[PDB]
Amino acid sequence: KIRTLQGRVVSDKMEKSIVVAIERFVKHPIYGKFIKRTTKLHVHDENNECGIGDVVEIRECRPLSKTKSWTLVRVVEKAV
Amino acid sequence: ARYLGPKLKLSRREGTDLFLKSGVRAIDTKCKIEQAPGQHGARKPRLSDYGVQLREKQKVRRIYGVLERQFRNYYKEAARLKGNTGENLLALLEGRLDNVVYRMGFGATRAEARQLVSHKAIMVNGRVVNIASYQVSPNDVVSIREKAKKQSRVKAALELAEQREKPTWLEVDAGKMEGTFKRKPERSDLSADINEHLIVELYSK
Amino acid sequence: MVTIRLARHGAKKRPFYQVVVADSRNARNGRFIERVGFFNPIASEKEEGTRLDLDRIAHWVGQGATISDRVAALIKEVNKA
Amino acid sequence: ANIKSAKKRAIQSEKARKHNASRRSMMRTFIKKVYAAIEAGDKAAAQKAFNEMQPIVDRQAAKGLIHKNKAARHKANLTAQINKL
RNA sequence: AAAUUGAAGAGUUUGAUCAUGGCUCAGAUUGAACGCUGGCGGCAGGCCUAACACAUGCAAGUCGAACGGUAACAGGAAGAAGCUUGCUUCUUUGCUGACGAGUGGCGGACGGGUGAGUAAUGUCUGGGAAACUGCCUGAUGGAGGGGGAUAACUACUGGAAACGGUAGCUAAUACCGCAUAACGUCGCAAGACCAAAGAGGGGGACCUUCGGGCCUCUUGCCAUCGGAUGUGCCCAGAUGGGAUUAGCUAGUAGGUGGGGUAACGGCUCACCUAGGCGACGAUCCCUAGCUGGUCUGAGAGGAUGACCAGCCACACUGGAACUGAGACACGGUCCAGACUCCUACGGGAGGCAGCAGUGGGGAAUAUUGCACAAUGGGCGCAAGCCUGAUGCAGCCAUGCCGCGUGUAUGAAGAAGGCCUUCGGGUUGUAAAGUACUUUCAGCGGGGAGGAAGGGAGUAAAGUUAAUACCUUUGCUCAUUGACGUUACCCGCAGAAGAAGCACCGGCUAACUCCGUGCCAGCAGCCGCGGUAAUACGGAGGGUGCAAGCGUUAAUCGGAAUUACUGGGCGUAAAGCGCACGCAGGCGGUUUGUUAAGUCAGAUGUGAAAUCCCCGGGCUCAACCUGGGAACUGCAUCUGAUACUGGCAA
Ligand SMILES: [Mg+2]
Ligand SMILES: [Mg+2]
Ligand SMILES: [Mg+2]
Ligand SMILES: [Mg+2]
Ligand SMILES: [Mg+2]
Ligand SMILES: [Mg+2]
Ligand SMILES: [Mg+2]
Ligand SMILES: [Mg+2]
Ligand SMILES: [Mg+2]
Ligand SMILES: [Mg+2]
Ligand SMILES: [Mg+2]
Ligand SMILES: [Mg+2]
Ligand SMILES: [Mg+2]
Ligand SMILES: [Mg+2]
Ligand SMILES: [Mg+2]
Ligand SMILES: [Mg+2]
Ligand SMILES: [Mg+2]
Ligand SMILES: [Mg+2]
Ligand SMILES: [Mg+2]
Ligand SMILES: [Mg+2]
Ligand SMILES: [Mg+2]
Ligand SMILES: [Mg+2]
Ligand SMILES: [Mg+2]
Ligand SMILES: [Mg+2]
Ligand SMILES: [Mg+2]
Ligand SMILES: [Mg+2]
Ligand SMILES: [Mg+2]
Ligand SMILES: [Mg+2]
Ligand SMILES: [Mg+2]
Ligand SMILES: [Mg+2]
Ligand SMILES: [Mg+2]
Ligand SMILES: [Mg+2]
Ligand SMILES: [Mg+2]
Ligand SMILES: [Mg+2]
Ligand SMILES: [Mg+2]
Ligand SMILES: [Mg+2]
Ligand SMILES: [Mg+2]
Ligand SMILES: [Mg+2]
Ligand SMILES: [Mg+2]
Ligand SMILES: [Mg+2]
Ligand SMILES: [Mg+2]
Ligand SMILES: [Mg+2]
Ligand SMILES: [Mg+2]
Ligand SMILES: [Mg+2]
Ligand SMILES: [Mg+2]
Ligand SMILES: [Mg+2]
Ligand SMILES: [Mg+2]
Ligand SMILES: [Mg+2]
């Protein structure tokens, strides 16, 4: 019962870290239409157990660096 | 403020009697009610919807002595209160202290009642009131003070009130110079010559 | 020091105090934490001039909130009933 | 300075500045001794300097010139660097 | 139970009509300004421009219950007193009450003001961990024994001053060791280490070196674990315009290892990877403090953020750091620069975007007023001191609300004015006259409330050996208000001291006459005026408001005229010249499952103030206030599975 977010992975070139393209379904305040405003983050990737195009679940932890504030807990649907 | 000019002029402009005089004599015996004031009188004015709404509002304003700034607030209060806006405005206007005094018969004219209230000859529930726009509540008692209970004008007012029609929602004891506001007056208990629907449409323009 | 005091409001010459718990650093009529009861010194009869929350005031006095002289006088008066 | 309290605190913050600077330099001298003995390769001189430095740092932290969180960091880092020899 | 109840259009394109479409107006508001006029009172408001420059007076001081000391003052034990035999001298004397100056503790980072800068290091909403925290409070313990010197002070001396320098003495809760070391720090552990300060009141003798020892009470000090409050940091979303800003970034993204901050972190350093942000708008330019809220609008919406409250930035300009629990500090300290000031020419001082106030700018915004008497804040055990915070007073019709400037009668329809067909009508019950009332303003007198506390005592309880000192509980006594000549109430006489502004062709309610002649002129649009102008100027009359009335500037509405609710593209403006196609938008039908969007409930929060509903109190109202609803939102949990979407068949 810990607040977590699930999203794709876009880049793995950085050492021991990845990025997550969190996607959501937000309703427009004015026109009342549902859109997809994505959100990018920097997630710690100890042991580099991830890959590009993979679905991951993350967790909010202490800031590891200037842009790092999230860490992963597992990996699911390791599509190639 | 208050209007200090002629009153039969306003009555002629409105085209009907507004009860601004004592009523000892008739209106025709004192003025030409059928002829509008000014050089261009003796011809019936031909007015539009805005004109007739303005005349309907001005008739009530001149009858009750209220001004535009104090009448718009009454209209706002009537609209704010639930129910018929037009009936609530009339009820609030009838709830004025000077109007209540005039209806009871302690004053021959509403202007005289206002003057008495200003000069502090009237108390409500034993407490004097110095405001001519005091809102009377049900089960209230309005009595004349001892200092001014021996007024020839204050007794001729009752002598004319007994000739005039009596209010159902009020009670009065002429011997004690006292009256009771029983209930809030209804639409049926008032005159039928006032079309209150012409004021709401005018103020919502 | 977190304290319980009286913040003044109302029109001129007719004040109305509210017993509130706030830090001594903050202003009188500015920032506070909780509002506990009011006080009308010019209130007439058959009209409550004090509606303090004794349970809530004790909850702060047990944590360290001090009490002003006027607040203590009002507490004594309300306890005298 | 238009206030007597400000005029007095002006020299109160100077005498205290001199005392705090002297104590800080005295502590940093032992800190530098430990850091210079660490990389020399010895494991006895560095340990002796650590025992010479620790009470001074603890006393300064108690007096309030520095913080116990900083004193603990200094001691832990020096001990970790010494234990690798 | 209630918490809402909410929608108007008109004029003008044209010989005439319809349609589309542009312009203007009736409406509601302002921190508003100008013209005319001007009775009062109550609650509110008052440099939006030059974050331009400031003369002058105040705005942060307090503690003798921290310690040396008495420069002033009064109360003196004693004695030198002129002697009057008690005293109107006066050395000396800190012993006493108190205290200039100084050391020291605390406060100065709160309170107050401004919005230049910041379009994100800021603000709001909702989540957190990796942190600190004086004064406040709970608990566990300790509180031992020493020292060297500095002020103030004395002598000398530099300098015009500001400001210092040298030689010497002394005090503490100032400073430093030092003694111990725990549930504190370090480390796997063993083990190492870090703290204090005392002060005041009263008493029985065991003691006294006659100062005090000794006992009790209060207060104060140090370590740790806590609590509350406050502060620092991080993430997600939201928070202006411009693409005629399409490429930016090398400490830049990350990693390893040191250093550093109270704390995580390129915060910083050495090395290694070439990454990171960006069409969902990176970067750059312009403007702009943000929010709760305010105006308009029925409503979604549009504009805006003055006064009340919360957050952020700043204190002449650009940077810096110390003390300090907490500033990189409005009235604290260095240095550089401009602007003033003193000068003996070597040299020094100052920062009103604090409260009043000055000059200048502008259309424009106030009194160098009283008081700490209340609520707060700082200091102090307390009394008590300070407080331009605050409570109040002064000016301004700037806005809101209330009252009045008299009521009744009063036709000979007075006189006069205006119009006229010359009969008359209008001003007109209007005035005068007649009886009455006196609110407000003025005079006199009375008179609440904002005042709870504090002090002096007394009795009891606690307290201890103790009826001592101290705390609490009651009771008694003389008191503590700037406002204030208070609110408020009662008599005096007398209608006396109190009404103006705009408009009258249509929009829009209200017409006649006289002077003029496309001249003078009005104007928001249509437009009027070229000898009978209801449109110019004046008079009479009338209409709308009212101590306000008009004009001007800004916002919204009408404008469905940026249309999500709520519009169009054949001919008024609007379909790319036509195709392919990435991202993207949408998507046939059945089952099963997940339950993200969506739907229901619950919890936390969504500050207070403001809107609204039900009431209450200032003689009503404005105004204040009690409770509730609401704050359409966000986060989490419990579920439902009809639809979209994720997965499989
Ligand atoms: Mg008025
Ligand atoms: Mg200086
Ligand atoms: Mg035409
Ligand atoms: Mg049109
Ligand atoms: Mg000055
Ligand atoms: Mg002194
Ligand atoms: Mg502001
Ligand atoms: Mg000490
Ligand atoms: Mg020790
Ligand atoms: Mg000691
Ligand atoms: Mg580098
Ligand atoms: Mg490290
Ligand atoms: Mg590091
Ligand atoms: Mg700005
Ligand atoms: Mg609309
Ligand atoms: Mg805005
Ligand atoms: Mg300036
Ligand atoms: Mg500066
Ligand atoms: Mg420091
Ligand atoms: Mg700052
Ligand atoms: Mg300061
Ligand atoms: Mg500064
Ligand atoms: Mg200043
Ligand atoms: Mg000023
Ligand atoms: Mg001026
Ligand atoms: Mg000027
Ligand atoms: Mg005070
Ligand atoms: Mg002073
Ligand atoms: Mg005549
Ligand atoms: Mg009077
Ligand atoms: Mg009193
Ligand atoms: Mg008309
Ligand atoms: Mg005109
Ligand atoms: Mg003519
Ligand atoms: Mg004219
Ligand atoms: Mg005229
Ligand atoms: Mg619109
Ligand atoms: Mg259209
Ligand atoms: Mg064409
Ligand atoms: Mg076309
Ligand atoms: Mg085509
Ligand atoms: Mg489908
Ligand atoms: Mg769901
Ligand atoms: Mg829900
Ligand atoms: Mg009431
Ligand atoms: Mg709220
Ligand atoms: Mg499906
Ligand atoms: Mg799809």
Tab-separated table of N, CA and C (backbone and C1' of nucleotides) and ligand atoms in Angstrom, chain A residues 36, chain E residues 585-587 644-646, ligand 48:
chain	number	residue	atom	x	y	z
A	36	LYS	N	-3.812	13.478	-22.963
A	36	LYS	CA	-2.705	12.692	-22.415
A	36	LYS	C	-1.497	13.612	-22.259
E	585	G	P	-3.272	10.872	-29.128
E	585	G	O5'	-4.579	11.346	-29.904
E	585	G	C5'	-5.136	12.633	-29.677
E	585	G	C4'	-6.343	12.872	-30.547
E	585	G	C3'	-7.352	11.737	-30.607
E	585	G	O3'	-8.214	11.685	-29.485
E	585	G	C1'	-6.887	12.457	-32.792
E	586	C	P	-8.541	10.270	-28.796
E	586	C	O5'	-9.566	9.583	-29.805
E	586	C	C5'	-10.803	10.207	-30.103
E	586	C	C4'	-11.457	9.622	-31.330
E	586	C	C3'	-11.799	8.143	-31.286
E	586	C	O3'	-12.939	7.830	-30.507
E	586	C	C1'	-10.800	8.633	-33.352
E	587	G	P	-12.997	6.438	-29.702
E	587	G	O5'	-13.087	5.326	-30.842
E	587	G	C5'	-14.276	5.158	-31.602
E	587	G	C4'	-14.040	4.351	-32.857
E	587	G	C3'	-13.881	2.848	-32.682
E	587	G	O3'	-15.117	2.171	-32.529
E	587	G	C1'	-12.201	3.654	-34.134
E	644	U	P	-16.980	0.482	-25.220
E	644	U	O5'	-15.887	1.585	-24.861
E	644	U	C5'	-15.849	2.828	-25.547
E	644	U	C4'	-14.678	3.670	-25.106
E	644	U	C3'	-13.318	2.992	-25.135
E	644	U	O3'	-12.736	2.956	-26.426
E	644	U	C1'	-13.585	4.111	-23.077
E	645	G	P	-11.824	1.707	-26.863
E	645	G	O5'	-10.559	1.791	-25.897
E	645	G	C5'	-9.631	2.860	-26.002
E	645	G	C4'	-8.716	2.928	-24.803
E	645	G	C3'	-7.873	1.694	-24.531
E	645	G	O3'	-6.722	1.610	-25.352
E	645	G	C1'	-8.872	2.410	-22.521
E	646	G	P	-6.160	0.174	-25.802
E	646	G	O5'	-5.491	-0.408	-24.478
E	646	G	C5'	-4.369	0.232	-23.887
E	646	G	C4'	-3.766	-0.609	-22.789
E	646	G	C3'	-3.645	-2.096	-23.081
E	646	G	O3'	-2.514	-2.414	-23.873
E	646	G	C1'	-4.573	-1.793	-20.932
F	48	MG	MG	-6.066	3.999	-29.306
